[PDB]
Amino acid sequence: LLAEHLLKPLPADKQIETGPFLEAVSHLPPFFDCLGSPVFTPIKADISGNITKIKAVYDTNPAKFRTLQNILEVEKEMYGAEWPKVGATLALMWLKRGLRFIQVFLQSICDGERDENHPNLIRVNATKAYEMALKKYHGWIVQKIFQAALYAAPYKSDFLKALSKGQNVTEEECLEKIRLFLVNYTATIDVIYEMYTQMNAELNYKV
Amino acid sequence: LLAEHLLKPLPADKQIETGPFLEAVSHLPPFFDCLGSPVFTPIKADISGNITKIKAVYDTNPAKFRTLQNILEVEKEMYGAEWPKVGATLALMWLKRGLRFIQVFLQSICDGERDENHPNLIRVNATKAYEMALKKYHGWIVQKIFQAALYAAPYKSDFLKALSKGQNVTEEECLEKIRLFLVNYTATIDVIYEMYTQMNAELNYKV
Ligand SMILES: CCCCCCCCCCCCC/C=C/[C@@H](O)[C@H](CO[C@@H]1O[C@H](COS(=O)(=O)O)[C@H](O)[C@H](OS(=O)(=O)O)[C@H]1O)NC(=O)CCCCCCCCCCC
Ligand SMILES: CCCCCCCCCCCCC/C=C/[C@@H](O)[C@H](CO[C@@H]1O[C@H](COS(=O)(=O)O)[C@H](O)[C@H](OS(=O)(=O)O)[C@H]1O)NC(=O)CCCCCCCCCCC
């Protein structure tokens, strides 16, 4: 699945076309279902909601919103002082954190990071991803909820199986496809984070 | 708010009309927002989803589905062995548990139940409601998530204020209106639970 929906390579000008980006990331919310528990359903819903919101804005005028940069710059001009805590800019501000979670989690698994005492769990990998992508934007109650939910995570072997079901491939081949996916995905997420910095569109509030 | 949307009294035959029931309970999901935290948003969404699902079935043929009993009996006949774990029957099987939670929580608050050490919290009341209505249908991970989320609950004084905002009433008057609401609400929920028993439509699985 993951490598059937590669993100586009980054052009020299590092502009990310909105339409194709949304099409690519729209295949990611089911990722959380390969975890195999309803504890992950509200997570899938929040990420899906960001995508829907960005698409809704884009759809008002696909030309005006041709790139993600166009979204931020247009909304900055359209709105007053509520920006960047509004519209597709806010939706993408949160979406990028979820996309980063997925990135760091997968890279960690591919890099062979594991608890040597429990090498068939993915807790260490998910925890690292959470710390790096999301933790600092959650109050202590939400952080407590994450720690609890992590117990729902599947066995690594089963998780990787779920990502390749039907394909009849080895775990080694599965990890190769994940690595391929991570190239343009990681590059794209980095560019989005950098855009947020350049545009002064990043906010640090906790929920 | 609560007592502006009283449930209908129960007729002698204890049949509950589907249309008016759905109209009444459709005012309850915002209840969870008077708690004043996004930790409660996924809860509001699950309860809303049950309501939407029941309404969707009803809307296919309001006459056929005139009462909640009609829903169970019609679906039992329509479906095979997947019933009652299907359709509006399953949706109502879960909705009733949420409605019972709300009932027990409110009754507990009105009955003056409190932790004498922390009398302005509503933790004891919510915990009682959870134990009585939902706990046994949750695995340990979800139960852990509830304990954590309960820390998000507001102060009692603030919760009751939120329920009467704009009305300029005393807490004593607010509690009187809640008590009024609880009469036909409690009666109706009891009848639904009893119907589930009579129809052998209740399932005891955990999530
Ligand atoms: C009785 C049963 C037990 C109780 C159950 C309690 C449930 C606990 C629920 C915890 C929350 C679930 C996950 C959701 C988290 C979200 O609060 C945050 C912030 O969400 C943003 O809030 C914003 C609020 O706007 S503001 O008021 O103006 O500030 C916006 O709504 C924004 O959406 S937008 O499109 O409209 O722009 C929205 O994403 N979301 C996240 O943290 C992202 C979640 C991604 C997680 C990545 C994967 C990790 C999951 C663990 C996997 C091991
Ligand atoms: C990184 C961020 C941190 C991680 C966040 C993790 C999020 C944790 C989420 C925990 C779950 C949130 C609450 C939802 C609970 C639901 O799983 C259960 C069961 O739901 C049912 O499942 C069913 C599954 O069907 S089956 O597969 O065939 O079995 C159906 O989907 C059914 O819907 S239906 O309309 O389609 O029929 C549906 O209600 N719901 C509940 O427990 C009810 C929740 C009401 C709670 C009442 C208020 C208490 C809240 C605490 C307040 C102090």
Numbering used by the authors:
A (entry chain A), B (entry chain A): 3 to 209
Copy the relevant paper text.
Human glycolipid transfer protein (hsGLTP) forms the prototypical GLTP fold and is characterized by a broad transfer selectivity for glycosphingolipids (GSLs). Encapsulation of lipid chains within the hydrophobic pocket involves a cleft-like gating mechanism that results in two glycolipid-binding modes.
The first noticeable deviations in the surface contact areas occur in wtGLTP–disulfatide complexes, which probably indicate a slightly different mutual orientation of monomers compared with wtGLTP–monosulfatide complexes. Indeed, careful comparison reveals some monomer–monomer′ contact redistribution in the dimer in the region of the α6–α6′ and α2–α2′ protein interactions and lipid–protein′ contacts. To elucidate the dynamics of intermolecular interactions in the GLTP–disulfatide complex, we comparatively analyzed two crystal forms of wtGLTP and two crystal forms of the D48V mutant complexed with 12:0 diSF. The crystals of the wtGLTP–disulfatide complex represent ‘open’ and ‘closed’ conformations of the dimeric arrangement. Interestingly, ligand adaptations also emerge with wtGLTP complexes bound with disulfatide.
